[PDB]
Amino acid sequence: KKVLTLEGDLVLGGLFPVHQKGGPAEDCGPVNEHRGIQRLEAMLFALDRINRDPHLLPGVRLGAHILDSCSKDTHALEQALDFVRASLTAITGVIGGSYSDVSIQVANLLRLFQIPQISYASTSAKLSDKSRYDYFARTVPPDFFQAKAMAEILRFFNWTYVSTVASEGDYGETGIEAFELEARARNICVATSEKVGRAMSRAAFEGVVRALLQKPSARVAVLFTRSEDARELLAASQRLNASFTWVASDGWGALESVVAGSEGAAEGAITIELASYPISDFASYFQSLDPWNNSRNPWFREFWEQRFRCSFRQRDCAAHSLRAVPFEQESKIMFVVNAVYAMAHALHNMHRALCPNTTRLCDAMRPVNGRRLYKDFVLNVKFDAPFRPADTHNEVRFDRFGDGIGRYNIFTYLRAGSGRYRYQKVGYWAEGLTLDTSLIPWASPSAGPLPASRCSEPCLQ
Amino acid sequence: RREIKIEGDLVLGGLFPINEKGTGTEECGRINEDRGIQRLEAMLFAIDEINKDDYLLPGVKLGVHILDTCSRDTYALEQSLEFVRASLIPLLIAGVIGGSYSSVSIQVANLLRLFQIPQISYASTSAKLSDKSRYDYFARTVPPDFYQAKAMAEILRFFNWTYVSTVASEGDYGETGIEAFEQEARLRNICIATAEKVGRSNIRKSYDSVIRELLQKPNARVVVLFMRSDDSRELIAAASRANASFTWVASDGWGAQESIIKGSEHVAYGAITLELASQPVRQFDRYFQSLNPYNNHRNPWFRDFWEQKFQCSLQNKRNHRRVCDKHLAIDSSNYEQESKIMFVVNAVYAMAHALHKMQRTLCPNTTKLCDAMKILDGKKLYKDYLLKINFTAPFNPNKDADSIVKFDTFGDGMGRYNVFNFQNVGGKYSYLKVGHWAETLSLDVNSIHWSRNSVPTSQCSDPC
Ligand SMILES: N[C@@H](CCC(=O)O)C(=O)O
Ligand SMILES: N[C@@H](CCC(=O)O)C(=O)O
């Protein structure tokens, strides 16, 4: 389909879920306005800043070959064939992969051709095995720490009898496995385990909701689901008028589309997002965008028609500006920028280590090999973050398996200011659980009894 | 590395698990005598039979591009890049008759679906496959693991075994099979005592924690195994070392092969396994029993195999072992046909007829290669011809409903199985058939030798 390409001495790959997962007939339809467009624009802004940065590759110009996977592993594999058909203008690195299943297939395909790949949102425990995925780095922590954080949250609220539902794939099953192993040490007990298939209809979701409702002792529900699966589960719960205490993962995060149309079923839901900070320049760059001048983004027009419900053939949205509409920045934006910088400084040190003659692209560096680059410049890189706010203490480094520091934030979906239905941060998680129950509406002692879920209530002593 | 690159007008590639996982060079060490060389020679014999006869595919000669998969999905993916190198000595492959493991088959199918190359498997039974949404160019000759789970649940219900434990192997075969088995057991009011997942990952059991946990709960003496042949052997060796005896209800991974049970017959005296319904092929036995390391130059591994089966290393000269040059050949006294040979031979002919009915339609004027068949698109070859193929078994004298080779709407085979019990007769341990399974159960309890010479029971609590 449409391919976003630029010109430069070195071309960096890309893979974003611009569109959402389609139905049985179509391939993939609606455009993702937060996880598919904002991340793409963040990568473009980071590339522009790097090109304009004199201290970072003053002579080498970084290109772009951003593709679209639209939340499909098969579509991602089909699109990634262009990254390897050039070599078999070659692709230096692939800054892409927002889903574990999407990124795993791309990494497997790229390992044969020795093309390094640095992800920005892939959070899977099975991606740390360097024997299977030799050339793969990540900026975000794996699920090994997220499962521990959710287990700690469950233990803190004296929850024992819980139910788990996960999406069928490489992100949900591994999440359930890790959560169960880390809960066996504790007293956390899982009642039932439910799976959501890739091609799941509304009847199956209703059946899953009924299966969860069959056992009434369990009041909470541990979630390893994507955005679409979580939204469908919430819609089914709202249709069945069932209320739970959802404990979700980075898949839900702080998105507003998951709670769109199902605010009743999502009340006091505890979710975990990755530790992140807003980018000051990215917000201005995104708000100062129009569908006419921004002709380098083929999907942007498709986004605009979905932003204000217009049609270019009907001569609409002639006076609509993105600046007036409030802007909500995706949590996993800075990581994307970091990922780009993870291939920027890696291409800056190497140029200063193998070709110390000029600042341009010398003839000796034309066949860039991913082996030495990943093994000596990508896996061990330390630099200051590009757009740090204030004077906090954070560093961008890769571990032995190409990971990041496991810091998380806990959000609750609460209604304040006459039912605004907003997410409120009630603590964080770096090495131990330090949440605050004061901000949580249902955790206040005056509000009422704490929601409890136990197999057997404590009888007479 | 070694490979077979026999040239021809049409080349049918294949992938075989000739070498075992690990045990040398961190990739692959020892050679599978049963599942690595017998299936390879069966495919070679089928290719020779197709070329030598005139009824099937006249004129056109079939070549092979057989490659070795070192029992690893990553190694298989690395090797399969040569099949699509021409479309990316470039050879145009019209079909890949290969894939013995579920993970290997899944990876190969994922790679091949981009290049439109039909693939037929012969031993990969999994429920993740046959999903045409993601695997649109895969068609196996074996039923999925759903029928195996149903059969094993029926077997457990027949003996009133309710409190059973389950051990599975991580990957695309053990996990899906054990999930289907858990669903079936929950359907039939069977509760799993404990669930383990044997694997080689960073955080996995070390082949002793599983046995320790099994011994921790003596009330459940029945263990249901969903494991491959690479892990089942090591698990049974560890069980023999720990001197822990349990009755085994194993899946197709264990099968009816004696390679797994080598030096650990005592620990697995009571073992019930499920195998695909296969009859021996006399022609294959005749072809294989006449093989020698001197007249077989087209099989690079065979010589090495000759050094392993007979325990006679140093075929040319060395002090490692005696040189058994002659006076000792493959005979019926120590050679047993694999229980899936007809599944790989039929895996080849399925494409051959697909290449026979296609050339009879595109250019029927000439019975040879034609310019119209220069490019072989996988869609027309698979959907139009391969999907709806229908032919009798090439080497079965009987002509019945069980001797037909036809696919289904999902590209599968008939779900018929046989139950083998490990019995010690006359001081010799061997597998004996004690029933079958074709949508029903026909176990013969009167002819089953148990581990403790009595029918085992596995209940959570003793009836009161
Ligand atoms: N981390 C989740 C999704 C991340 C995201 O796209 O927000 C995954 O690996 O599928
Ligand atoms: N049939 C097993 C593999 C063992 C074999 O028959 O070769 C599977 O489903 O993967």
B125 is in an annotated binding site: yes
Q: Measure the CA–CA gap between A348 and B229, rounded to whole angstroms.
A: 49
Please return the burial class of B26, using the count of CB atoms within 10 Å of its CB with bins 0-12, 13-18 and 19+. exposed
| Chain A interface includes B323 (CB < 8 A) | no
B231 is in an annotated binding site: no
Separation of CA B441 and ligand 2 centre (Å): 23
Query: Treating both helix axes as pointing N-terminal to C-terminal, what angle do A100-112 and B73-80 enclose, rounded to 10 degrees?
Result: 60
Torsion sign across C-alpha atoms A236, A239, A240, A245: positive
Q: Measure the CA–CA gap between B317 and B314, rounded to whole angstroms.
A: 5
Q: Measure the CA–CA gap between A147 and A183, rounded to whole angstroms.
A: 9
CA A404 to chain centre: 14
What residues contact A133, with CB distance under 8 A and at least 6 apart?
A: A104, A107, A108, A111, A127
What residues contact A191, with CB distance under 8 A and at least 6 apart?
A: A161, A162, A163, A215, A217, A218, A455
Residue closest by Cα to atom 4 of ligand 2: B253
B37 contacts B121 by C-beta, under 8 angstroms: no
State residue B323 phi and psi, 5-degree precision: -90, 100
Selection from A350, A333, A430, A429 nearest residue A386 by Cα: A333
**Residue of B102, B225, B226, B274 best suited for mutating to test ligand 2, as the one with most atoms within 8 Å of CB:** B102
What experiment produced this structure?
Answer: cryo-EM
Separation of CA A37 and ligand 1 centre (Å): 15
A14 contacts A43 by C-beta, under 8 angstroms: yes
Q: Is the CB of A231 under 6 A from ligand 1?
A: no
Selection from B280, B277, B272, B210 nearest residue B238 by Cα: B210
Domain with residue A149: its CATH number is 3.40.50.2300
Q: Which ligand is nearest to the CA of A138?
A: 1
Selection from A260, A27, A275, A311 nearest residue A141 by Cα: A275
Maximum pairwise Cα distance, chain A: 83
Please return the burial class of B175, using the count of CB atoms within 10 Å of its CB with bins 0-12, 13-18 and 19+. buried
State residue B320 phi and psi, 5-degree precision: -65, -40
Q: Is the CB of A99 under 6 A from ligand 1?
A: yes
* Min distance B114 CA to chain A CA atoms (Å): 6
B406, containing H or E segment: strand B404-406
Q: Is the CB of A173 under 6 A from ligand 1?
A: no
Q: Measure the CA–CA gap between B13 and B342, rounded to whole angstroms.
A: 18
Choose the mutation target among A27, A73, A74 for the interface with B, i.e. most B CBs under 10 Å.
Answer: A74
What residues contact B341, with CB distance under 8 A and at least 6 apart?
A: B38, B39, B42, B278, B280, B281, B284
| Chain B interface includes A25 (CB < 8 A) | no
Residue closest by Cα to atom 4 of ligand 1: A121
Structure tokens at A86: 């050039």
- CA dihedral of B113, B118, B121, B125, whole degrees rounded to 10: 50
| Chain A interface includes B88 (CB < 8 A) | yes
B429, containing H or E segment: strand B428-437
Q: Give the residue numbers spanning the domain of A259.
A: 143-276+407-435
Q: Is the CB of A122 under 6 A from ligand 1?
A: yes
Size of interface A-B (CB pairs under 8 A): 32
Query: Treating both helix axes as pointing N-terminal to C-terminal, what angle do A172-185 and A143-156 enclose, rounded to 10 degrees?
Result: 50
What residues contact B401, with CB distance under 8 A and at least 6 apart?
A: none
Residues of A in Cβ contact (< 8 Å) with B201: 126, 129
Selection from A34, A235, B382, A24 nearest residue A16 by Cα: A34
Query: Tokens 């809960």 sit at which residue?
Result: A183
After which residues is chain B discontinuous, taking C to N > 2.5 Å? 88
Residues of B in Cβ contact (< 8 Å) with A78: 114
| Chain B interface includes A199 (CB < 8 A) | yes
Q: Is the CB of B256 under 6 A from ligand 2?
A: no
What residues contact B382, with CB distance under 8 A and at least 6 apart?
A: B118, B137, B139
A155 is in an annotated binding site: no
Task: State the amino acid at position B162 in one-letter form.
Answer: T
Counting Cα atoms < 13 Å in the Cβ hemisphere of A315 gives 0
Structure tokens at A374: 């990943």
What is the three-state SS of chain A? CCCCCCCCCEEEEEEECCECCCCCCCCCCCECCCCCCHHHHHHHHHHHHHHHCCCCCCCCCEEEEEEECCCCHHHHHHHHHHHHHCCCCCEEEEEECCCHHHHHHHHHHHHHCCCCEEECCCCCHHHHCCCCCCCCEECCCCHHHHHHHHHHHHHHCCCCEEEEEEECCCCHHHHHHHHHHHHHHCCCEEEEEEEECCCCCHHHHHHHHHHHHHCCCCCEEEEECCHHHHHHHHHHHHHCCCCCEEECCCCCCCCCCCCCCCCCCCCCCEEEEECCCCCHHHHHHHHCCCCCCCCCCHHHHHHHHHHHCCCHHHCCCCCCCCCCCCCCCCHHHHHHHHHHHHHHHHHHHHHHHHCCCCCCCCHHHCCCCHHHHHHHHHCCCEECCCCCCCCCCCCEECCCCCCCCCCEEEEEEECCCCCCCEEEEEEEECCCECCCCCCCCCCCCCCCCCCCCCCCCCCCC
Q: Measure the CA–CA gap between A235 and B212, rounded to whole angstroms.
A: 45
Residues of A in Cβ contact (< 8 Å) with B77: 108, 112
Structure tokens at B90: 């470039």
| Chain A interface includes B38 (CB < 8 A) | no
Q: Is the CB of B125 under 6 A from ligand 2?
A: yes
Residues of A in Cβ contact (< 8 Å) with B88: 85, 88
Contact between chains at A126 and B201 (C-beta distance less than 8 A): yes
Structure tokens at B242: 């720990």
| Chain B interface includes A206 (CB < 8 A) | no
Contact between chains at A112 and B203 (C-beta distance less than 8 A): no
Separation of CA B149 and ligand 2 centre (Å): 14
Q: Measure the CA–CA gap between B63 and B6, rounded to whole angstroms.
A: 5
| 93-132 of B, contacting A, C-beta below 8 A | 107, 110-111, 113-114
Q: Measure the CA–CA gap between B261 and B81, rounded to whole angstroms.
A: 35
Alpha carbon of B169 to those of A249, A436, B103: distances in Å? 27, 42, 12
What residues contact A38, with CB distance under 8 A and at least 6 apart?
A: A286, A329, A330, A333
State this model's resolution in angstroms: 3.3
| Chain B interface includes A112 (CB < 8 A) | yes
Query: Tokens 């993105």 sit at which residue?
Result: A322
B429 is in an annotated binding site: no
State residue B176 phi and psi, 5-degree precision: -65, -40
